[PDB]
Design a binder for this molecule. Structure first.
Ligand SMILES: *[C@@H]1O[C@H](CO)[C@@H](O[C@@H]2O[C@H](CO)[C@@H](O)[C@H](O)[C@H]2NC(C)=O)[C@H](O)[C@H]1NC(C)=O
Ligand SMILES: *[C@@H]1O[C@H](CO)[C@@H](O[C@@H]2O[C@H](CO)[C@@H](O)[C@H](O)[C@H]2NC(C)=O)[C@H](O)[C@H]1NC(C)=O
Ligand SMILES: *[C@@H]1O[C@H](CO)[C@@H](O[C@@H]2O[C@H](CO)[C@@H](O)[C@H](O)[C@H]2NC(C)=O)[C@H](O)[C@H]1NC(C)=O
Ligand SMILES: *[C@@H]1O[C@H](CO)[C@@H](O)[C@H](O)[C@H]1NC(C)=O
Ligand SMILES: OC[C@H]1NNC[C@@H](O)[C@H]1O
Ligand SMILES: [Ca+2]
Length: 641
């Protein structure tokens, strides 16, 4: 009926911010080669204050060279004694975010680790000092090379934590003058981290935040007992249709209401990865076409705005928050300066399902809500109004100012389902706008890269999405024809997060492609045992990269070749001998049309008319037989979709 909003008996918990995740894995991959002005517009929609999503928090993967859901991300230490703070795109992303919002909150978290850290095992806790050293080096490098202060460091994404590790990490941070960096644990379930904090005073002292993943808006008693900040440190992960926007809307409110969670962070920030990779289009917005410049400012961008534009880290929740009698919810926040923001959501069950977890049916119907301002809030006589109706739809439209002339300190709204209202004393709101970007277009049916770039802006060529191993721009001054190539740089399997393939592979192009010719120059660096391939119709990647089928054309340095239907090479289409050795450049051509394929070595037919599964479709790819050095040059693909 009537809902009292008051601060007279005190406040709720301090609000910590809303944010999102770039990484886990390669989610921002296709954003970096967007042309201007579009790339900048996109970043504005995400990070510019009083414009779009206006995010408070940006969380990034600390790359460890392993597959971490939609690709691999490069580490700052590929090998022991290697340090490089200019690989990948997270440094870049953090700097761009910080340009737009200097007060943005930055977090880092590992999914995978380089293999050499395991000292013979695929386990990051064999040598605690070494793994901590690796992680703290990343934080120092953020400061020293990019001028970034990292605000939070995590442990091991959705993987077990080690209590001694967390203690060592704290000790190591302090030792490096990083006392201001805070630790969040354990980026998995509420347990066992929450009970561990109650049983262990030394652990409790070194953990600042408990971050849980996909909590379904609820927490647990031990976490409440701990007296720590509780965050939903990863959530969302749903397609950014109106449905995903509903999910995002409902949980932004009800994570605090049901779970005492004072921050929620979406996976992922922006869908800049091929859609046919796992969890396609599950960012706050979509930017998966750098070749065309087309992006989509999806509904979740404006759902975020209803909170982010009108709240800031350091505001407090009121004690008076809760559910609406006939479905939906409301929260209210103040800054202690006389401002007040009220956020109301009436998301229906059928239009707000998240993938994790799936809620049992709940009912939402039309209602009227009366709000009365008590305490220091009663003196407010004016409120700005912002409204969204999820579809057709109607996004972040500003409505007529609401007045409380009465002295009643009270007002009433008619609510329907799937709506959001934000009522705030703040006048800075804005639905940011750029002109529409170019129309969507498929990946170019003809495409080439000679990798001839002497001072590349990024460490890898555009559109190549690594799904196992890591491929990088390589300069070899000792060669003239192949001075600038693409190189696979891992020489051992990472401490894996997902199930990386046995073979390295990078995919590119249009998953719809079914007839195609792929050509590339390849160089095998390992004598006798080495091998490489090119391929087409590659149908799976990411977390499923081991499942990938297609047509794979391998040559080996022992004078041999293979044609397989799968990346794992279990299934044979054809095989035989070839004049192939190590440390020599060959040109491979692979042609696939309907039921048949052919391969060429240096322009001369090696095998022809080999029958392959059809129908079938997928990306083009390059790669190596194991985790081994190899080079590639003059990539070309022609395809029909
Ligand atoms: C966490 O939030 C819950 C609400 O979900 C708080 O628990 C109580 O909530 C009921 C209504 O659901 C109120 O009537 C009680 O007043 C709340 N408890 C108290 C002690 O006020 C709970 O307080 C919160 N825990 C914190 C802030 O540590
Ligand atoms: C609401 O918030 C605004 C912005 O934080 C407050 O305005 C600021 O007030 C501080 C001091 O209180 C000044 O130093 C800033 O220059 C002000 N900034 C702007 C943009 O006005 C405002 O006082 C708060 N309270 C109300 C009732 O609006
Ligand atoms: C890919 O190539 C196959 C093989 O040529 C094409 O399939 C043939 O299409 C013609 C005319 O469309 C038919 O008369 C043949 O019977 C088809 N062959 C088979 C085995 O189905 C296919 O259309 C091509 N696809 C694209 C997108 O170019
Ligand atoms: C939802 O609530 C309305 C109002 O009480 C009711 O008429 C309707 O049957 C409910 N729907 C379900 C599925 O229970
Ligand atoms: O929904 C899938 C997400 N889960 N958390 C880890 C992330 O990298 C994603 O795989
Ligand atoms: Ca070249």
């Amino acid at each position: 009926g009537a809902y009292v909003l008051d601060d007279s008996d005190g406040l709720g918990r301090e609000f910590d911010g809303i944010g999102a995740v770039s990484g886990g894995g390669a989610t921002s991959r296709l954003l970096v080669n967007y042309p201007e002005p579009y790339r900048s517009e996109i970043l504005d929609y995400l990070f510019k204050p009083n414009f779009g999503a206006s995010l408070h928090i940006l969380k990034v993967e600390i790359g460890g060279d392993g597959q971490t859901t939609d690709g691999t991300e490069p580490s700052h230490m590929h090998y022991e004694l290697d340090e490089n703070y200019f690989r990948g795109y997270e440094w870049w992303l953090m700097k761009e975010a910080k340009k737009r919002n200097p007060d943005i909150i930055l977090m880092g978290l590992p999914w995978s680790f380089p293999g050499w850290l395991g000292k013979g095992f695929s386990w990051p806790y064999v040598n605690l000092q070494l793994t901590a050293y690796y992680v703290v080096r990343w934080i120092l490098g953020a400061k020293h090379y990019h001028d970034l202060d990292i605000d939070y460091i995590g442990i091991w994404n959705e993987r077990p934590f080690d209590a001694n590790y967390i203690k060592e990490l704290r000790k190591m941070l302090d030792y490096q003058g990083l006392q201001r960096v805070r630790i969040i644990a354990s980026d998995n379930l509420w347990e066992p981290i929450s009970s561990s904090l109650l049983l262990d005073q030394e652990l409790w002292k070194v953990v600042d935040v408990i971050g849980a993943h996909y909590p379904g808006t609820y927490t647990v008693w031990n976490a409440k007992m701990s007296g720590k900040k509780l965050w939903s440190s990863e959530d969302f992960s749903t397609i950014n249709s109106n449905v995903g926007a509903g999910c995002w809307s409902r949980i932004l409110n009800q994570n605090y209401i049901n779970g005492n969670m004072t921050s929620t962070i979406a996976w992922n920030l922006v869908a800049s990865y091929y859609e046919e990779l796992p969890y396609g289009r599950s960012g706050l917005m979509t930017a998966q076409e750098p070749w065309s410049g087309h992006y989509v400012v999806a509904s979740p961008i404006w759902v975020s705005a209803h909170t982010t534009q009108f709240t800031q880290p350091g505001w407090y929740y009121l004690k008076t928050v809760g559910h609406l009698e006939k479905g939906g919810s409301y929260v209210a926040l103040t800054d202690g300066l006389g401002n007040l923001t009220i956020i109301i959501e009436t998301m229906s069950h059928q239009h707000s399902m998240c993938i994790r977890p799936y809620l049992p049916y709940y009912n939402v119907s039309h209602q009227l809500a009366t709000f009365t301002l008590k305490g220091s809030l009663r003196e407010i006589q004016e409120l700005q109004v912002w409204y969204t109706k999820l579809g057709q739809r109607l996004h972040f439209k500003q409505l007529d100012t609401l007045w409380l002339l009465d002295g009643s300190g009270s007002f009433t709204l008619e609510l329907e389902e799937d709506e959001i209202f934000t009522l705030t004393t703040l006048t800075t709101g804005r639905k940011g706008s750029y002109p529409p970007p170019p129309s969507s277009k498929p990946f170019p049916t003809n495409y080439k890269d000679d990798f001839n770039v002497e001072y590349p802006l990024f460490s890898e060529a555009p559109n190549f999405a690594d799904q196992t191993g890591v491929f990088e721009y390589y300069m070899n001054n000792e060669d003239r024809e192949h001075r600038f190539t693409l190189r696979q740089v891992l020489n051992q399997r990472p401490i894996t997060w997902a199930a990386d393939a046995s073979s390295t592979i990078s995919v590119i192009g249009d998953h719809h492609w079914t007839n195609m010719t792929v050509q590339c120059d390849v160089y095998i660096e390992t004598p006798r045992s080495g091998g490489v391939f090119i391929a087409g119709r590659v149908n799976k990647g990411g977390i499923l990269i081991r499942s990938a089928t297609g047509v794979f054309f391998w040559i080996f340095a022992n004078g041999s070749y293979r044609v397989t239907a799968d990346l794992g090479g279990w299934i044979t289409y054809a095989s035989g001998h070839a004049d192939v050795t190590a440390k020599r450049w060959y040109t491979l051509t692979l042609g696939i049309k309907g039921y048949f394929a052919f391969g060429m070595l240096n322009g001369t037919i090696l095998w022809k008319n080999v029958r392959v599964k059809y129908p079938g479709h997928g990306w083009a790819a390059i790669g190596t037989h194991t985790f081994e050095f190899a080079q590639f040059d003059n990539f070309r693909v022609e395809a029909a979709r």
